[PDB]
Amino acid sequence: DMYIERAGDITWEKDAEVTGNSPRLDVALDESGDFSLVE
Amino acid sequence: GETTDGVYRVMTRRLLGSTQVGVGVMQEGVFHTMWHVTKGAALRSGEGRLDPYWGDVKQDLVSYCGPWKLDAAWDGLSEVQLLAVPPGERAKNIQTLPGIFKTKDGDIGAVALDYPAGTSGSPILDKCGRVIGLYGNGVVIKNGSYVSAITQGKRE
Numbered sequence: 001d002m003y004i005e006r007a008g009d010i011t012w013e014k015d016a017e018v019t020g021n022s023p024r025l026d027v028a029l030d031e032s033g034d035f036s037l038v039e
Numbered sequence: 040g041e042t043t044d045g046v047y048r049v050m051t052r053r054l055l056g057s058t059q060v061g062v063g064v065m066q067e068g069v070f071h072t073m074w075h076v077t078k079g080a081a082l083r084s085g086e087g088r089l090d091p092y093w094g095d096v097k098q099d100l101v102s103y104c105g106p107w108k109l110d111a112a113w114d115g116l117s118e119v120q121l122l123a124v125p126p127g128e129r130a131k132n133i134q135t136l137p138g139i140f141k142t143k144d145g146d147i148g149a150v151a152l153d154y155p156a157g158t159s160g161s162p163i164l165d166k167c168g169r170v171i172g173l174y175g176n177g178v179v180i181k182n183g184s185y186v187s188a189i190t191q192g193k194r195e
Protein backbone atom coordinates (compact mmCIF):
# COMPACT_ATOMS: atom_id res chain seq x y z
CA ASP A 1 0.00 0.00 0.00
CA MET A 2 0.89 3.68 -0.56
CA TYR A 3 0.43 6.48 2.01
CA ILE A 4 0.49 10.32 2.16
CA GLU A 5 2.54 12.68 4.52
CA ARG A 6 2.22 16.52 4.80
CA ALA A 7 5.13 18.57 3.35
CA GLY A 8 3.98 22.21 3.68
CA ASP A 9 1.48 24.98 2.91
CA ILE A 10 0.62 26.19 -0.59
CA THR A 11 1.86 29.82 -0.37
CA TRP A 12 3.72 32.22 -2.73
CA GLU A 13 7.13 33.01 -1.18
CA LYS A 14 8.85 36.29 -2.15
CA ASP A 15 12.64 36.24 -2.74
CA ALA A 16 12.71 32.63 -3.96
CA GLU A 17 15.48 31.14 -6.21
CA VAL A 18 14.74 32.41 -9.78
CA THR A 19 15.96 29.90 -12.42
CA GLY A 20 14.81 28.15 -15.63
CA ASN A 21 14.52 29.32 -19.25
CA SER A 22 11.13 29.68 -21.17
CA PRO A 23 11.17 27.52 -24.38
CA ARG A 24 8.50 27.23 -27.19
CA LEU A 25 8.50 23.51 -28.16
CA ASP A 26 6.32 21.87 -30.85
CA VAL A 27 4.99 18.76 -29.01
CA ALA A 28 2.39 15.88 -29.39
CA LEU A 29 0.30 14.03 -26.76
CA ASP A 30 -0.38 10.33 -27.29
CA GLU A 31 -3.40 8.25 -26.10
CA SER A 32 -1.17 7.00 -23.21
CA GLY A 33 -0.41 10.45 -21.72
CA ASP A 34 3.18 10.50 -23.10
CA PHE A 35 4.49 13.81 -24.49
CA SER A 36 6.51 13.51 -27.73
CA LEU A 37 8.70 16.14 -29.42
CA VAL A 38 7.59 17.03 -32.99
CA GLU A 39 10.30 17.82 -35.57
CA GLY B 40 -7.60 10.77 8.93
CA GLU B 41 -5.36 13.80 8.17
CA THR B 42 -7.23 15.95 5.59
CA THR B 43 -5.73 19.41 6.32
CA ASP B 44 -5.18 21.59 3.19
CA GLY B 45 -1.61 21.69 1.77
CA VAL B 46 1.08 19.83 -0.22
CA TYR B 47 1.74 16.14 0.59
CA ARG B 48 4.37 13.48 -0.21
CA VAL B 49 3.16 10.20 -1.73
CA MET B 50 5.24 7.31 -0.25
CA THR B 51 5.43 3.44 -0.36
CA ARG B 52 6.95 0.49 1.58
CA ARG B 53 6.85 -2.05 -1.39
CA LEU B 54 10.59 -1.51 -2.15
CA LEU B 55 13.70 -0.83 0.06
CA GLY B 56 12.47 0.99 3.18
CA SER B 57 10.26 4.04 2.52
CA THR B 58 10.47 5.45 -1.04
CA GLN B 59 8.90 8.70 -2.40
CA VAL B 60 6.96 7.90 -5.63
CA GLY B 61 5.36 11.35 -6.08
CA VAL B 62 3.67 14.48 -4.61
CA GLY B 63 0.02 15.64 -4.36
CA VAL B 64 -2.13 18.66 -3.37
CA MET B 65 -4.89 18.40 -0.73
CA GLN B 66 -7.59 21.08 -1.31
CA GLU B 67 -11.22 21.32 -0.14
CA GLY B 68 -11.03 17.73 1.17
CA VAL B 69 -9.86 16.38 -2.24
CA PHE B 70 -6.39 14.89 -2.86
CA HIS B 71 -5.13 15.84 -6.35
CA THR B 72 -2.12 14.02 -7.81
CA MET B 73 -0.76 12.70 -11.18
CA TRP B 74 -1.97 9.25 -12.40
CA HIS B 75 1.53 7.81 -12.98
CA VAL B 76 2.30 8.22 -9.23
CA THR B 77 -0.48 5.97 -7.85
CA LYS B 78 -1.59 4.20 -11.08
CA GLY B 79 -5.13 4.54 -9.54
CA ALA B 80 -4.37 2.72 -6.25
CA ALA B 81 -5.96 3.64 -2.89
CA LEU B 82 -3.93 5.62 -0.30
CA ARG B 83 -3.58 5.67 3.52
CA SER B 84 -3.64 8.92 5.52
CA GLY B 85 -2.91 8.25 9.21
CA GLU B 86 -5.50 5.53 9.80
CA GLY B 87 -7.82 6.72 6.96
CA ARG B 88 -8.32 5.54 3.38
CA LEU B 89 -8.24 7.71 0.28
CA ASP B 90 -10.23 5.95 -2.45
CA PRO B 91 -10.12 7.31 -6.04
CA TYR B 92 -13.02 9.37 -7.42
CA TRP B 93 -11.92 10.59 -10.85
CA GLY B 94 -8.88 9.73 -12.98
CA ASP B 95 -7.70 9.94 -16.58
CA VAL B 96 -4.57 8.42 -18.17
CA LYS B 97 -4.39 10.89 -21.12
CA GLN B 98 -4.52 13.90 -18.77
CA ASP B 99 -2.30 11.99 -16.24
CA LEU B 100 -4.43 13.26 -13.30
CA VAL B 101 -6.28 11.57 -10.41
CA SER B 102 -8.48 12.99 -7.56
CA TYR B 103 -9.38 11.19 -4.27
CA CYS B 104 -12.52 11.68 -2.08
CA GLY B 105 -14.10 13.97 -4.70
CA PRO B 106 -13.98 15.66 -8.10
CA TRP B 107 -11.04 17.75 -9.41
CA LYS B 108 -11.12 21.13 -7.52
CA LEU B 109 -8.12 23.12 -8.83
CA ASP B 110 -9.29 25.47 -11.60
CA ALA B 111 -6.85 28.45 -11.90
CA ALA B 112 -4.61 28.89 -15.00
CA TRP B 113 -1.36 30.64 -16.02
CA ASP B 114 -2.05 34.02 -17.71
CA GLY B 115 0.63 33.44 -20.40
CA LEU B 116 2.59 36.46 -19.15
CA SER B 117 3.46 36.11 -15.45
CA GLU B 118 6.23 34.24 -13.65
CA VAL B 119 5.04 31.31 -11.51
CA GLN B 120 6.38 29.21 -8.59
CA LEU B 121 6.97 25.45 -8.64
CA LEU B 122 6.53 24.46 -4.97
CA ALA B 123 8.78 21.47 -5.52
CA VAL B 124 8.80 18.74 -2.84
CA PRO B 125 11.94 16.63 -3.64
CA PRO B 126 12.52 13.08 -2.29
CA GLY B 127 14.35 13.13 1.03
CA GLU B 128 14.58 16.93 0.89
CA ARG B 129 12.37 19.71 2.36
CA ALA B 130 9.71 21.60 0.25
CA LYS B 131 11.30 24.44 -1.79
CA ASN B 132 9.72 27.27 -3.89
CA ILE B 133 11.42 27.91 -7.24
CA GLN B 134 10.31 30.88 -9.31
CA THR B 135 10.45 30.78 -13.17
CA LEU B 136 8.70 32.07 -16.36
CA PRO B 137 7.07 29.13 -18.16
CA GLY B 138 7.48 28.47 -21.86
CA ILE B 139 4.99 26.94 -24.34
CA PHE B 140 4.11 23.42 -25.60
CA LYS B 141 2.71 24.04 -29.10
CA THR B 142 0.19 21.23 -29.78
CA LYS B 143 -2.51 20.52 -32.43
CA ASP B 144 -5.14 20.96 -29.58
CA GLY B 145 -3.92 24.25 -28.06
CA ASP B 146 -1.06 25.84 -26.12
CA ILE B 147 -0.02 24.72 -22.60
CA GLY B 148 2.45 26.36 -20.22
CA ALA B 149 5.69 24.51 -19.44
CA VAL B 150 8.30 24.70 -16.68
CA ALA B 151 11.93 23.97 -17.60
CA LEU B 152 13.09 22.59 -14.23
CA ASP B 153 14.84 19.24 -13.74
CA TYR B 154 13.93 17.29 -10.56
CA PRO B 155 14.09 13.55 -9.62
CA ALA B 156 11.10 11.34 -10.67
CA GLY B 157 9.61 11.40 -7.12
CA THR B 158 9.00 15.15 -7.38
CA SER B 159 6.07 14.40 -9.83
CA GLY B 160 2.83 15.91 -8.58
CA SER B 161 4.38 19.10 -7.09
CA PRO B 162 2.13 22.15 -7.70
CA ILE B 163 2.72 25.22 -9.85
CA LEU B 164 1.43 28.40 -8.15
CA ASP B 165 0.49 31.91 -9.22
CA LYS B 166 1.16 35.25 -7.32
CA CYS B 167 -1.81 34.46 -5.00
CA GLY B 168 -0.71 30.95 -4.07
CA ARG B 169 -3.51 29.56 -6.32
CA VAL B 170 -2.77 26.14 -7.87
CA ILE B 171 -2.53 26.56 -11.67
CA GLY B 172 -1.33 22.97 -12.39
CA LEU B 173 0.94 20.02 -11.44
CA TYR B 174 4.61 19.26 -12.44
CA GLY B 175 5.68 15.79 -13.57
CA ASN B 176 4.47 15.12 -17.12
CA GLY B 177 6.61 16.46 -19.92
CA VAL B 178 9.43 15.79 -22.40
CA VAL B 179 13.25 15.65 -22.81
CA ILE B 180 14.59 18.27 -25.27
CA LYS B 181 17.72 18.31 -27.63
CA ASN B 182 20.33 19.35 -24.97
CA GLY B 183 18.99 16.68 -22.55
CA SER B 184 17.24 18.97 -20.04
CA TYR B 185 13.69 18.24 -18.89
CA VAL B 186 10.64 20.43 -19.67
CA SER B 187 7.42 19.50 -17.78
CA ALA B 188 3.96 20.77 -18.70
CA ILE B 189 1.74 22.77 -16.31
CA THR B 190 -0.90 19.98 -16.18
CA GLN B 191 -4.28 21.30 -14.95
CA GLY B 192 -7.62 19.48 -14.54
CA LYS B 193 -11.19 20.59 -15.14
CA ARG B 194 -13.55 21.69 -12.33
CA GLU B 195 -17.09 20.30 -12.61
Ligand SMILES: O=C(c1csc([C@H]2CCCNC2)n1)N1CC[C@H](c2cccnc2)C1
Nearest residue numbers: 033034075099154155156159175176177185
Ligand atom coordinates in the same frame (compact mmCIF):
# COMPACT_ATOMS: atom_id res chain seq x y z
O1 LIG C 1 7.50 13.36 -17.05
C1 LIG C 1 7.96 12.35 -16.52
C2 LIG C 1 8.96 12.51 -15.43
C3 LIG C 1 8.83 13.43 -14.44
S1 LIG C 1 10.31 13.63 -13.60
C4 LIG C 1 11.01 12.40 -14.62
C5 LIG C 1 12.48 12.05 -14.60
C6 LIG C 1 13.00 11.81 -16.04
C7 LIG C 1 14.53 11.90 -16.13
C8 LIG C 1 15.04 13.23 -15.59
N1 LIG C 1 14.06 13.96 -14.77
C9 LIG C 1 13.35 13.05 -13.85
N2 LIG C 1 10.14 11.80 -15.39
N3 LIG C 1 7.59 11.14 -16.97
C10 LIG C 1 7.81 10.72 -18.36
C11 LIG C 1 7.65 9.22 -18.29
C12 LIG C 1 6.52 9.05 -17.27
C13 LIG C 1 5.12 8.95 -17.83
C14 LIG C 1 4.65 7.75 -18.34
C15 LIG C 1 3.37 7.67 -18.83
C16 LIG C 1 2.58 8.78 -18.78
N4 LIG C 1 2.99 9.95 -18.28
C17 LIG C 1 4.25 10.03 -17.81
C18 LIG C 1 6.78 10.15 -16.23
